Amino acid sequence: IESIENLEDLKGHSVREWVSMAGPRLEIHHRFKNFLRTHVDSHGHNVFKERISDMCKENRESLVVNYEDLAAREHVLAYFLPEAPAELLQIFDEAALEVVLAMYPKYDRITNHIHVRISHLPLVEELRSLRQLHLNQLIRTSGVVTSCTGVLPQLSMVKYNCNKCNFVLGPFCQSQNQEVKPGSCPECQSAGPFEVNMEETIYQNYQRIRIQESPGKVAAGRLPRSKDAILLADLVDSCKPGDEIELTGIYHNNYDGSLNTANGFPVFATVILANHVAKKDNKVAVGELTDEDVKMITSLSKDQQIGEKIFASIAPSIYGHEDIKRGLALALFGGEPKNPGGKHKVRGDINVLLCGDPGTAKSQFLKYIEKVSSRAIFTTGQGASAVGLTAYVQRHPVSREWTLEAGALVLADRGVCLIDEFDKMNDQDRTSIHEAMEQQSISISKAGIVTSLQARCTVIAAANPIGGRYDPSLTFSENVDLTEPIISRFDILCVVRDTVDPVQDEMLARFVVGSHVRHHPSYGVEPLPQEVLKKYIIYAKERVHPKLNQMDQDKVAKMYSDLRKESMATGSIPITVRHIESMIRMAEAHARIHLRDYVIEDDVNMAIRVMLESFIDTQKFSVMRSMRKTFARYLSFRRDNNELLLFILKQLVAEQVTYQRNVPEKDLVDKARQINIHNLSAFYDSELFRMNKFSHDLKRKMI
Amino acid sequence: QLYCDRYLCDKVVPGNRVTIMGIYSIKKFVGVGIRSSYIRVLGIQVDTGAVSPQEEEEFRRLAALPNVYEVISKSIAPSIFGGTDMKKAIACLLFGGSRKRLPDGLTRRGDINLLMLGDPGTAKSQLLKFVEKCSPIGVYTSGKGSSAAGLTASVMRDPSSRNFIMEGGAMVLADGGVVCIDEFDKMREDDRVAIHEAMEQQTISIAKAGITTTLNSRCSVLAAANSVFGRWDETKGEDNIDFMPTILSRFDMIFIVKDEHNEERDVMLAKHVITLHVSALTQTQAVEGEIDLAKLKKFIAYCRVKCGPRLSAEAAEKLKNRYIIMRSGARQHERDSDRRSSIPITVRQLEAIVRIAEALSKMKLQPFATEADVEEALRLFQVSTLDAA
Amino acid sequence: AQAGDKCDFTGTLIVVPDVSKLSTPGARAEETEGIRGLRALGVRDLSYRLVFLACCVAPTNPTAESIKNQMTVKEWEKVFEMSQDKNLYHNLCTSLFPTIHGNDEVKRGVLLMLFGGVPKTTGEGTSLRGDINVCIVGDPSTAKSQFLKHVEEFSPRAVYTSGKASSAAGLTAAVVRDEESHEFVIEAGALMLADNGVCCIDEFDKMDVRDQVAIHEAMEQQTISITKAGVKATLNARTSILAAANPISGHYDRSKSLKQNINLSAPIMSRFDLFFILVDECNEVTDYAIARRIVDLHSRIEVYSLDDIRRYLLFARQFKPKISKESEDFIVEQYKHLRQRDGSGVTKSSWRITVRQLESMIRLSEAMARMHCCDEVQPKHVKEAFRLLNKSIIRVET
DNA sequence: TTAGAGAATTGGAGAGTGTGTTTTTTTTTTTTT
DNA sequence: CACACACTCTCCAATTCTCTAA
């Protein structure tokens, strides 16, 4: 077969038969092999070497190709791909298998076929806009998955035992169109009750989903359109009911006598043969992270001011509210679940309650967390129910047996449940979340179903006080209207007030008007870009797991004991035992923010500060100052310790001068590791050595 | 779906945890080439009706040693600081009394019902989660997430054949064991009145859609609840309880649990919690002076199936006189208050004391309950009587 | 064509057989008696039903570039005339509200509510509200409902509704069982139907509790979040609200503040950009003028037309004014003035000046610049917006 | 030039094969009570 | 199961082609 120098001249054919014949088929095969081997990104890095290597590391049998890259590098393949998608995807699968077995010669033991998936295809279509013009073409659509079958085995290459003799009928390919009837046995011509040879038959995973238009893209009072889609092989369980997805697939039609007799006209059934599923929720998975991305994340973690940067990156368009940003950062990164002895589970997720005045950006904080977090569920007040929050039982739509279904807390199982207008809920709806908040489970005993579902989510709620205005004359317990069991289930408990303060009002006004200028259609520390923050968050949550070695038990124990005393004194907030475990969770969350594999006293002091400041915030005006001096003098607001390193430096300089008269930074840091004062960067940024005329340089190491 | 064959039939029941060994296969007599799959079971390993003789004689030893009650109580929820009387009552609930049928055919309940009621953050849910895992038969359900039909038993039509069938609820699934009803104050009153018969008579009489029967629900109810005002709020007294006297009289013990703010208690509790969180990485080493959960589960099952005690005569005399004294005290307390207490002291509470004494003896595999057992039962019950008065 | 539309269908009446009875080589076959004797029909009988086959559909009685190309040169000239008109503010007010006697400030507020601000999206993806919300409180004898009627009959895509619900879905949304599927589905409310429009809510003081709660999310975040059995949804409610309300006990008292005169809570109060109050003064000359105007509208009648204002509004709303630095300084200083003035009554139950009122000033100045088709907001626009906002604060206090 | 006797082709009768069929109750959930 | 429809195949004989005599 001679190489074909121009695929583009169809010479009167259509694309389907043109690429079906051998010459153009081999030319397409070689072009796709060369594309995979030689395509490089803007930095010159061979992207497909990395992608195939990751696929073979993880045994995933599927290779995502970016259509933008294909169109940029090899034009005619991008030209023919949407016109004859089945044929070219078959050729691409063959070529990808050749390249994969060139890279990893033993990968045939793991797979026998590589599925090339296409992403970022510009041929986006609305479900309501699909026409007969799109038939047998590669389309891209969006919608919410509303139904899913179980993963079912489907015949792909089926063999039949002959009904009389021992012969086996040849491989017949399943089509998605009709049942394959064997015909007659070529040995003996019998055509009786044939039966499938299960052992010699090749099966494939099958899953039929129904997607419909997303409820925010449909018009009000209008019914949504929907399509069936077939997921085959490793595309099964790419989505669940409720998932917003983008779906690339072949728009396929076949004759259906049922539709013909339903309509009275020869109407053909339609289905999408899915090629690529991408959840609009998970725009970036952990598998999508490249070596550049993880190198960026790990190098960025070494900044040593990263905690302030991460805190500042929480809702960068909101002035002030540094304590809110801190608490939301800790909740967003989260702690670690633990189960000592396999018999005592304790939650790792941190729950947050933002109570306070109108127009104080509580809802804006909640919508920011919704936007930034993967697996965010947002709900509001009366719009939620006990049943809808937790889980619900219904007659199955077609078969009519009772079936359990996932509520918001179950759907957010490794994510965030956001409850705006939390005080406006019904008590019966609000009490439903207790088990999910603490025990991280939802137990249902209804209509013959008796089971517990996992609801390991983090609850971030927003509320108003009684009368819609916080009263410093009263404590939090006196003006919230919530009760102790629900108040104690929130680890971080924030009060936001809108009191007059002219200088802060001027700065806030300038920030707000500057924001309106910046975002037109066209604290000090600087934040991360939000894309980088999302990548950092998912890496920190999935690839990093803090472990607590010690936390200086005496400090936290004494703190908890007298925090209990003052809570009993004022009645401002119940403290129970949950606040201790909140301390451990917040320490683990700060360690995760710093990407530490092990928790340290830096994290413990951060958690201590958060707890004490919020508890102080719950108090009245006069009581608040006395509480401030109480917990500040006696307990640990460990701001800095520069004096010890200062006189260690002075002592070392005095001894060195005395030695020389009659590498100092190495001497200093040696003493700083000998004594438990290891955070020396703070001393090097502080003024105490500077006005004493010392200085530092990481290269010269002289001071 | 699982296909079992010959002796694998009735080797398991709903609620069992299993490891199946079998052939993944299609049935062979939505889509075109779709085939329904199932596992043809070739072996069943119930993860955990028989005790090996070595386990058997070790259980005899464990019952024989003199401080078995204390060892069991320390084995109940070892990760929980304090609550020793509550753990002891839970041990009595786990072992249960002795069920009896009298000469006239009337049955007397053997199981013990326990209600924990009060302040938040007092490990009530952790105790329920322990008991559900430690009991040989045990189910956990939230009061909010349950209904009358789903608790006792439900009636429904089958798509395979248009006839009405029964499906067991929590009580039926836990028949022979414990139902751990968390959030017990949250369930609806109409759903709460469903379990009265299953609590006392230990039966569920259904007459619905033509099918009329009486199922068995011989199970303990261990319930957790909060006060009406969240915390107990000690000035309120009887207004802290919205439960009816009917449901409250069906509970053998009602532990009103109050979170006591004491400084040394708080320091010890905090150090315990911090050490508990710290020790998660320590390879799960064995411990002295207590029973592992997997062993205590088997021991409870063995004692339940083997030993049913009775009261001795002198022990019964002691119980009689103490009951009369307690009844007079309760009457005079209600008269002095000029108001009815939410917790009534009834003949079911007498029989509850009897059941607790029998459970204490069953821990030791003794055919008879002694005055010591009756005294300990009365000591545990007088916490519930403290909770009444 | 969509369900509820009244359409003229042009085509043919045809007859469609029961095709399930017909057996052919392509496909085999699946109280009145049909016609018989066809080979394809066998021993069965063929019934018929009448079906209309429409070659054309139309209604029975009916981008920026898209607007430009759709409209005509004469319409361009009229748009340019209005853009260059002096006294355009009051001209548009009088043209939109001819039946209304007086209440010239309420007319201005409603006009700027129609023009609206510029929506924006933050760097983190959260949205900043562009729509303007206005509430008209007054005695039942005043013109509060007539403002809503004029707005609704002027503007397209607008809804009129009472605070009390005519349906299971009231203002926001509801969840009801499908009669065909026996399945829980959304029923859309007035705000959802008014998405990207104006919702004129009369008797706003009489909301049901579900709407009283969900209006919090609908008025500021412009979404309605539903979490019930069988349905999880975030429903867009990008609507400008024109509310009308009655004082408690049915009449206003000027000695009391508006917070004392109406039952709206402080969270609901903070949502509205402008508040207006109508008191029925027992003034004989005003009654004289009212009767004259009404009977003239009924007898004699038998500046600008509403169609012209529709075209000009549709043209002008595509403008996106930017904030000048000097106008930014003016907004900042005006908000500092407003906040420190509110500090004199913050301890004594004022309509406390939240950040929402700063952003309402921004929205109102942007609406002014849109009305004048300006590329950039100016201190004159900021001053007029501040005038309306400040007068609303003062009238709310007393 | 017509038509009639013998041989070959086409019409259709009928023998044989394969396919399809005979209001009711309990429970949930949201909204309305 | 069993009793009607629906469909195919085969054989039989009736009509038309070819060659001859009246």
Ligand SMILES: Nc1ncnc2c1ncn2[C@@H]1O[C@H](COP(=O)(O)OP(=O)(O)NP(=O)(O)O)[C@@H](O)[C@H]1O
């Ligand atoms: N400190 C702030 N910085 C920036 N914008 C702010 C700030 N405080 C309030 N806002 C703005 O105020 C508006 C209202 O915010 P929102 O989150 O709805 O308030 P809220 O906390 O939800 N009050 P409420 O809904 O009654 O409970 C938004 O446009 C915010 O951007």
Ligand SMILES: Nc1ncnc2c1ncn2[C@@H]1O[C@H](COP(=O)(O)OP(=O)(O)NP(=O)(O)O)[C@@H](O)[C@H]1O
């Ligand atoms: N004495 C204790 N020892 C150890 N952990 C404890 C103790 N008391 C409370 N906790 C912890 O507190 C948390 C809450 O426990 P939980 O079982 O929910 O108590 P509860 O009384 O049921 N709370 P509530 O449902 O609001 O009444 C868990 O993480 C427990 O481990």
Ligand SMILES: [Mg+2]
């Ligand atoms: Mg809010």
Ligand SMILES: [Mg+2]
């Ligand atoms: Mg609990």
Ligand SMILES: [Zn+2]
């Ligand atoms: Zn054969």
